[PDB]
Ligand binder design. Structure first.
Ligand SMILES: *[C@@H](C)[C@H]1/C(=C/c2[nH]c(/C=C3N=C(/C=C4\NC(=O)C(CC)=C4C)C(C)=C\3CCC(=O)O)c(CCC(=O)O)c2C)NC(=O)[C@@H]1C
Ligand SMILES: *[C@@H](C)[C@H]1/C(=C/c2[nH]c(/C=C3N=C(/C=C4\NC(=O)C(CC)=C4C)C(C)=C\3CCC(=O)O)c(CCC(=O)O)c2C)NC(=O)[C@@H]1C
Ligand SMILES: *[C@H](C)[C@H]1/C(=C/c2[nH]c(/C=C3N=C(/C=C4\NC(=O)C(CC)=C4C)C(C)=C\3CCC(=O)O)c(CCC(=O)O)c2C)NC(=O)[C@@H]1C
Ligand SMILES: *[C@H](C)[C@H]1/C(=C/c2[nH]c(/C=C3N=C(/C=C4\NC(=O)C(CC)=C4C)C(C)=C\3CCC(=O)O)c(CCC(=O)O)c2C)NC(=O)[C@@H]1C
Ligand SMILES: *[C@H](C)[C@H]1/C(=C/c2[nH]c(/C=C3N=C(/C=C4\NC(=O)C(CC)=C4C)C(C)=C\3CCC(=O)O)c(CCC(=O)O)c2C)NC(=O)[C@@H]1C
Ligand SMILES: *[C@H](C)[C@H]1/C(=C/c2[nH]c(/C=C3N=C(/C=C4\NC(=O)C(CC)=C4C)C(C)=C\3CCC(=O)O)c(CCC(=O)O)c2C)NC(=O)[C@@H]1C
Ligand SMILES: *[C@H](C)[C@H]1/C(=C/c2[nH]c(/C=C3N=C(/C=C4\NC(=O)C(CC)=C4C)C(C)=C\3CCC(=O)O)c(CCC(=O)O)c2C)NC(=O)[C@@H]1C
Ligand SMILES: *[C@H](C)[C@H]1/C(=C/c2[nH]c(/C=C3N=C(/C=C4\NC(=O)C(CC)=C4C)C(C)=C\3CCC(=O)O)c(CCC(=O)O)c2C)NC(=O)[C@@H]1C
Ligand SMILES: *[C@H](C)[C@H]1/C(=C/c2[nH]c(/C=C3N=C(/C=C4\NC(=O)C(CC)=C4C)C(C)=C\3CCC(=O)O)c(CCC(=O)O)c2C)NC(=O)[C@@H]1C
Ligand SMILES: *[C@H](C)[C@H]1/C(=C/c2[nH]c(/C=C3N=C(/C=C4\NC(=O)C(CC)=C4C)C(C)=C\3CCC(=O)O)c(CCC(=O)O)c2C)NC(=O)[C@@H]1C
Ligand SMILES: *[C@H](C)[C@H]1/C(=C/c2[nH]c(/C=C3N=C(/C=C4\NC(=O)C(CC)=C4C)C(C)=C\3CCC(=O)O)c(CCC(=O)O)c2C)NC(=O)[C@@H]1C
Ligand SMILES: *[C@H](C)[C@H]1/C(=C/c2[nH]c(/C=C3N=C(/C=C4\NC(=O)C(CC)=C4C)C(C)=C\3CCC(=O)O)c(CCC(=O)O)c2C)NC(=O)[C@@H]1C
Lengths: 162, 172, 289, 194, 162, 172, 172, 172
């Protein structure tokens, strides 16, 4: 669970020392990024359903075979589409968690760790989720620091998948 | 471990829901309190040696039997172990104040500490008394109005006091 | 030749340095160049103060009264040479220095040490210097009119053991042969006695792990006797020489130089561990297969 | 998969002890001291006691001993070879559960007791996922091992005895014999007398 | 390298022991399997080009998008088709190596180790190679112990991929 | 390792003198150019996998003998090792860009890297070519004017180029 | 480590080619020789202790300077090291015979052995003489005709002789 | 160096007694094999340029990374150094065949060659591959039954193969 405050305390405790001005500057950077991150999390939360549906539709457009090929790993039926929308919602919600926490820790703990075994086992191609994340990047309509931090989390997820 | 943000994040993920508007506003209010939190951490850190030494001196003045021969704090090694324990408890209290969550204090300092003291014969009640003396000295240092931007630091003082009480109760 | 690793070693300045030959009917710059080259190479790049310069030998070489070979002989027999290289050195180190200066190569085997030590002890230093200079090797390489130079490149009667030992004797261009880490100690006594070689460690500014030197004892052997068995399943084994280990501090760190035989699968971990311990990798050599 | 996060517990090894060398300080058996053959015998026997408690000559690894004597391998490599040896697999891995194999690995490699049942649980999956040698190398390449024993020192039970106290914690060879009640009842012991 | 003789010797050597009757039985089992394995390798080698071309075509039939979707990771152009045929040839040739060596050691050292990082990095789906291996299983025309050993290697690759 | 401030600190300490006004305002310029450095690090990191994969594809297209059987990048394990190496070089270049000093790159990445490639038979020239391809892609991504507050990033781009050049010279 | 099959497999993989018919038939010829290979391994193994002990006794009888006071085989630890070195060489010869390849004997027994012997002052020539004694004893045991299915074992005997000569050449 | 006679002479002198009847008979056997030794040396020497050129062509065909621009056999100076190295290895192998002892090959050519190749960045595995190619070519040249008094030369061929193996192992 990687966030600036927890990482600062982990570094100080590993060396067995009190929090010096280095950790205070870390906290200052966390405070500087925090409000932007929280409004971005709120903006993503309010526009979550449309973003998830559009990302799922974009994946279906980029990979049409997922919509008519039979099999458990495809979205040919309604169950597969529900699984796809649920996964994209998981991605978006954990990204908002990362924005709230100020680090990739929620993605690392909830989604990134073990996702390779998931996709290999259930024959889900990571390129689908990469397309969903790219749609989210292009369409969240954020700006400035909020956009930069949210895009950092989405690119972190993309890099993990690719 | 957890900080203020990560605790709410973990709870929301267990619920499988986005952080609500109320939780986001509460976290923003915590962020607005952040400068005072950093000042509190800095002030306790800058006087940590004084806090530990003065609290130890007061503890051994009101409990002379600790430093009498045959007492637990008697001999340099034990006495130094006691000072070091007090410093460690204070350091993890500062960690908890910095992160705003008690997870670091519980997981890395107080986990099994009572059992360690029971095994060694260290009087846990006297450790709690030393922790309380650290608490009072630390809170006075955090609330000192000289040379700082005036404002209401009651919430951070209460949170630090809660961490100190938690450390004292883990060993008492 | 040496092309890719020439700059990393100290070979690059000698790659474009042609041998200094004194032609018949030479000019005065030719004479001064021969004097300068002889001082630099025979005295092993030591600074030569004006009061220590052999004025008479220089005059005679300038005049043509002596040849380049004779001037080299006079410099090598001079009190300046003996003060720099003979009087404070073990005679095996003297032999190493003689081979490096007068022949531009490292000793090949213990037989050369035997010959030169016997000759010094039975007939003196001057006769030993003469044997270096009247040798067939000297005649074929330098002859009468060419200043001796470092013979880095492969030649007709070479052994590769000499190529490895050259970088034990030569430690870079801005180095002076009396300003090397091992100082007055013989660099090749163990190697010549045991007929062994050391992994080549390049000079200081081009190689971070330049300062690695094995200790008197407790050194990891070159090859991995036993194969991969002590390391469980492993593909290949490598001997890694590490220098400047300091971070943990004494007593955790006893010797700042350490050679370790590690499997291929632990090479990443070995490198990270080296970075943590503040060390510099001097060389990595295959140890198995 | 990343290891489970488990909280540490208050231990003597976690805290500064201000130790001065005495009869209770474990002997530092290190090859950095250029040991004679008899001192190497002592170091080798210390490694055998740390890893196997006792080593019958059926349990000895004479090839590993020769390799350590020649400088082929470090002390840590010899410890790894002891842990990868048939004796260690038969006595400590085979006769125990995975959880009680992590204990007998934390205890004699890191020289400390396990933090909790959760630590045992977290490290027990490593054998079945990364392999047996995966677990051995993870423990040997850990920061705890390298910071305490490095490459050249035989591991030992750390900070067992506090100064002034008559008795410290139980030695791990007493606390944790090769097997426990599971293999005990598989063997058919305890046996009734008379 | 996981083959019966090398594994028997490595296990004996790690124990520092002479080869006992257990290792001799390992050699006897290897001798029992070796002729059938060598004949399977010969049959696969003699039919290598046809098996590889048919496997590539089966992959293209089951996943048609791989033949008309532009991108470096697809076989839309001749370059991707050559890469695909070369990959399937790698699979078949290393399977023959396994049949010769009597174990999955060639697959492990040459193909299995690190294949998931390759597939993730170059956005190649393991399901394509799974279909190719299924084609090789169904059309190698082997029987008996040859078929069982070859199918064991092909299933090993399939399980490593899926 | 050193950062940009710690480097001049170490030089001044070796000279035993306070940082002069010129050094102080050079550091103030460094701080003033801090946002662009952070942007460059973030842009290289966010496209790291694409940089590594595209550079690997270009390198193996220009040098097909690397990936043909018997080539050093042939077999899955050696291919994965090559890819990982590319990612490691990119990661340490980003670290050096973040710190403002190439000490992390020398001490933690290129320390023993040539030696390791030689010992293994890894062609140093080819990995240098891969590092150059990563250099062109990374500098292209850093200098991308879309979606960012316009400004002159020539200095930070030149610094990143120097880090990549030093890595390429270290491996060949 | 290479056995007889994996050696040709690795060469083929490096060349990127399938094994030709001639290579497959050579491996089949090796397979047809396997029973005799297993008998030779079993017979040497069955008398390993006798082979090592008798060879050492004969070597010390014809070379009394090894076991003289101050000789290299004097003192119990050095004598035991000598007996061990003999047993290790014999065991690795059996390993090479079993695999049909000298890679195990080369890599794990002979690589660096000459250097170790020279460094310690162990006379490599005497080690080679002891290895020759184990050679002759072992080959007489493998060639013993009673109690075994009669057959031509000249090829296997020549291969074991080659391993023994290779060991003797390496130690000297 | 040592030849086949001086080797046993040195071992006997170290032992301090006369060559035994068996040693003299083994030497007489080696003398009886002298014509075939001379024939093999003559045949490799007469075909030395063909062996070196053909094996270099095969090596650069199977390892094109050696001769790509940036490879270690690229540029004339390097190509020529590589060809010269292969001829040098062949020449010292022939010397070892002539003397009946490997000491000239080990002591003058192979000792330190691995360290040399590591220092220069010469890939030793490719050198070993070229040496193996010279081995196969030279062995097929020695065994050619055309234009020579027929006989069994398997022992001499095995000895030459052993010298080539020592050369190939010394460089990797
Ligand atoms: C030269 C080495 C000697 C020799 C060998 C030889 N053996 C066989 C045949 C067999 N030997 C065995 C071996 C074993 N059976 C076991 O169960 C054990 C213990 C695990 C062993 C070692 C086997 C299975 C056979 C086949 C059946 C049989 O009993 O004959 C042969 C015959 C040819 C063949 O390859 O099978 C030969 C030649 N014979 C000699 O005369 C040499 C002194
Ligand atoms: C394996 C090496 C091949 C082989 C050799 C072989 N040669 C001979 C016999 C002789 N070879 C020579 C050679 C030379 N005479 C010269 O004047 C020179 C030039 C300087 C040479 C190299 C000689 C003198 C003899 C003896 C007379 C003769 O011509 O036969 C033999 C016969 C046995 C012997 O030791 O004399 C053999 C076996 N034979 C093969 O089949 C291999 C391909
Ligand atoms: C959508 C982009 C594509 C798609 C989706 C799809 N996914 C599954 C199954 C699973 N998805 C996950 C992923 C997660 N679970 C989590 O808890 C999290 C972290 C918070 C993630 C990212 C998992 C674990 C599964 C398998 C278990 C489950 O059923 O939930 C399926 C079904 C696969 C199956 O075999 O039933 C599908 C269909 N399908 C498409 O075609 C889209 C392109
Ligand atoms: C002066 C600022 C500091 C200092 C210097 C000092 N240096 C030496 C000795 C040598 N300096 C060199 C350097 C070079 N020689 C070259 O040819 C080149 C260019 C290729 C360089 C850079 C060498 C090789 C030597 C040794 C040769 C010699 O004759 O000494 C000394 C002399 C040391 C001594 O005499 O013991 C000194 C004093 N010393 C200071 O205190 C200054 C900080
Ligand atoms: C005699 C009492 C003991 C003895 C001697 C012995 N020494 C050697 C060989 C060498 N001795 C030296 C010595 C020196 N080198 C120097 O530079 C100096 C003077 C400044 C000294 C004293 C060297 C370098 C050698 C090697 C060269 C050579 O061999 O002559 C040997 C020969 C070793 C061999 O195996 O060749 C011997 C015999 N040996 C004993 O047993 C006596 C106890
Ligand atoms: C060719 C198969 C491979 C190859 C070779 C290569 N070698 C060098 C350079 C040298 N080779 C030697 C070797 C020896 N010197 C000796 O005296 C002896 C015999 C006693 C040997 C075997 C040495 C010492 C060098 C450097 C000195 C010199 O070349 O004169 C190079 C040149 C490297 C460079 O230019 O930096 C090369 C190319 N390279 C390959 O890629 C082939 C696999
Ligand atoms: C003091 C008179 C001089 C001096 C000393 C100095 N030493 C170090 C660092 C180390 N010294 C050691 C020591 C030993 N290793 C051993 O095994 C032994 C015998 C048991 C000894 C004496 C070691 C290992 C180190 C490195 C690790 C450590 O620092 O503990 C330093 C520090 C060097 C640095 O910059 O890291 C210094 C300064 N320096 C002087 O100027 C005096 C002349
Ligand atoms: C001082 C206020 C009181 C006191 C203290 C005392 N404590 C010890 C010994 C130890 N304390 C610890 C504690 C910790 N280990 C952990 O992991 C954590 C979190 C990081 C803590 C706080 C432990 C493990 C020990 C034993 C190890 C050691 O002492 O080095 C002593 C010494 C007891 C002894 O017998 O030596 C003492 C004296 N004693 C008092 O009287 C005060 C009330
Ligand atoms: C065919 C089933 C489908 C397909 C194939 C395809 N593969 C690649 C590229 C690579 N394939 C490999 C595989 C291996 N190389 C090895 O060394 C081994 C072990 C023997 C294996 C299995 C690798 C490593 C690559 C990447 C680098 C390379 O060029 O070799 C491509 C090219 C992708 C790219 O970006 O260049 C393609 C197209 N694609 C399809 O659509 C087919 C259905
Ligand atoms: C890819 C562009 C080129 C290439 C790469 C290649 N590298 C290796 C092996 C290793 N690379 C390293 C380097 C590092 N390890 C680290 O942890 C770090 C940070 C300090 C670095 C820089 C190491 C140590 C190894 C060996 C250990 C390991 O696990 O791989 C290989 C594999 C070589 C082999 O398997 O024999 C390869 C293929 N190869 C090319 O052809 C490209 C030019
Ligand atoms: C240089 C290569 C390119 C460039 C950069 C540039 N950036 C800024 C200013 C800012 N960039 C940031 C960055 C972030 N905010 C976040 O929340 C995150 C994630 C944590 C990041 C990476 C910030 C905070 C600023 C300042 C406020 C602002 O938005 O402007 C500038 C402006 C000057 C400055 O140094 O601040 C510039 C020039 N612009 C280009 O055109 C280059 C391609
Ligand atoms: C016995 C025939 C002769 C002899 C032997 C002798 N050897 C040593 C010491 C060592 N021998 C080895 C060899 C190996 N160990 C390995 O791990 C491997 C690979 C599996 C081999 C082959 C080693 C490494 C040593 C050094 C370390 C050790 O003590 O074992 C000695 C002892 C020398 C000493 O104790 O100083 C001896 C006596 N000596 C004779 O005289 C016989 C001719």
């Amino acid at each position: 669970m990687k966030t600036p405050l927890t990482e600062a305390v982990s570094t100080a405790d590993s060396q067995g020392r009190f929090l010096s001005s280095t950790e205070l500057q870390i906290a200052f950077g966390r405070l500087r990024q925090a409000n932007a991150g929280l409004q971005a999390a709120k903006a993503l939360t309010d526009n979550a359903q449309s973003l998830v549906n559009g990302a799922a539709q974009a994946v279906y457009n980029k990979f049409p075979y997922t919509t008519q090929t039979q099999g458990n790993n495809f979205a040919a039926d309604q169950r597969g589409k529900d699984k796809c929308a649920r996964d994209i919602g998981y991605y978006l919600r954990i990204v908002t968690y990362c924005l709230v926490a100020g680090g990739t820790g929620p993605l690392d703990e909830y989604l990134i760790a073990g996702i390779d075994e998931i996709n290999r086992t259930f024959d889900l191609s990571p390129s689908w989720y990469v397309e969903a994340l790219k749609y989210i990047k292009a369409n969240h309509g954020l700006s400035g620091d909020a956009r930069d931090e949210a895009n950092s989390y989405l690119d972190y997820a993309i890099n993990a998948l690719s | 471990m957890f900080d203020v943000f990560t605790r709410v994040v973990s709870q929301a993920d267990a619920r499988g829901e986005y952080l609500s508007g109320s939780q986001l506003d509460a976290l923003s209010a915590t962020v607005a309190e952040g400068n005072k939190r950093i000042d509190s951490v800095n002030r306790i850190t800058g006087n940590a040696s004084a806090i530990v030494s003065n609290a130890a001196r007061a503890l051994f003045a009101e409990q002379p039997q600790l430093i009498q021969p045959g007492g637990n704090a008697y001999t340099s090694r034990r006495m130094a172990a006691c000072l070091r324990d007090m410093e460690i408890i204070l350091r993890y209290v500062t960690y908890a104040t910095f992160t705003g969550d008690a997870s670091v204090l519980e997981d890395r300092c107080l986990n099994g500490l009572r059992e360690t003291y029971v095994a060694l014969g260290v009087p846990g009640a006297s450790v709690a008394a030393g922790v309380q003396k650290m608490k009072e000295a630390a809170l006075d240092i955090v609330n000192d109005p000289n040379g700082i931007t005036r404002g209401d630091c009651s919430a951070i003082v209460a949170e630090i006091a809660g961490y100190f009480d938690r450390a004292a109760a883990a060993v008492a | 030749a040496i092309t890719t690793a020439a700059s990393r070693l100290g070979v690059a300045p000698y790659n474009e340095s042609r041998p200094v030959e004194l032609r018949p009917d030479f000019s005065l710059d030719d004479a001064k160049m021969v004097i300068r080259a002889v001082y630099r190479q025979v005295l092993g790049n030591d600074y030569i103060m004006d009061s220590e310069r052999l004025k008479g030998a220089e005059s005679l070489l300038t005049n043509g009264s002596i040849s380049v070979r004779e001037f080299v002989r006079t410099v090598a027999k001079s009190e300046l040479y003996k003060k720099k290289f003979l009087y404070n050195n073990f005679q095996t180190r003297v032999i190493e220095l003689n081979y490096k200066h007068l022949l531009g190569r490292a000793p090949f085997s213990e037989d050369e040490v035997i010959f030169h030590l016997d000759l010094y002890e039975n007939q003196g230093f001057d006769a030993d210097i003469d044997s270096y200079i009247d040798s067939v090797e000297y005649q074929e390489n330098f002859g009468e009119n060419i200043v001796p130079y470092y013979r880095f490149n492969n030649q007709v009667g070479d052994r590769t053991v000499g190529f490895t030992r050259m970088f034990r004797l030569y430690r870079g261009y801005a180095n002076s042969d009396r300003s090397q880490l091992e100082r007055s100690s013989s660099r090749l006594a163990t190697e010549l006695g045991q007929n062994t070689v050391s992994a080549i460690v390049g000079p200081s500014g081009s190689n971070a792990g330049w300062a690695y030197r094995p200790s008197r004892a407790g050194n990891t052997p070159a090859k991995a006797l036993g194969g991969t068995v002590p390391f469980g399943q492993a593909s290949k084994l490598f001997r890694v020489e590490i220098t400047a280990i300091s971070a943990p501090g004494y007593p955790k760190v006893r010797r700042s130089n350490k050679a370790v035989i590690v499997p291929f699968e632990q090479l990443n971990q070995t490198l990270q561990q080296i970075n943590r311990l503040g060390g510099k990798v001097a060389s990595i050599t295959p140890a198995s297969l | 998969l990343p290891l489970l996060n488990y909280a540490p517990k208050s231990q003597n090894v976690r805290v500064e002890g201000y130790e001065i060398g005495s009869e209770e300080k474990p002997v530092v058996f290190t090859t950095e001291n250029i040991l004679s053959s008899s001192d190497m015998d002592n170091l080798i026997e210390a490694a055998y006691r740390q890893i196997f408690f006792h080593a019958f000559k059926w349990d000895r690894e004479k090839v590993l001993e020769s390799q350590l004597r020649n400088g082929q391998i470090t002390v840590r490599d010899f410890v790894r070879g002891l842990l990868l040896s048939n004796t260690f697999r038969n006595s400590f891995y085979e006769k125990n559960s995975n959880y009680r194999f992590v204990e007998h690995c934390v205890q004699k490699i890191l020289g400390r007791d396990v933090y909790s049942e959760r630590e045992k649980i977290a490290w027990s999956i490593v054998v079945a996922t990364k392999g047996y040698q995966g677990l051995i190398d993870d423990l040997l390449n850990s920061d705890e091992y390298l910071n305490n024993f490095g490459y050249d020192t035989v591991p030992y039970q750390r900070r067992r005895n506090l100064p002034g106290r008559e008795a410290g914690e139980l030695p791990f060879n007493i606390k944790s014999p090769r097997y426990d009640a599971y293999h005990r009842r598989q063997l058919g012991f305890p046996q009734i007398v008379w």
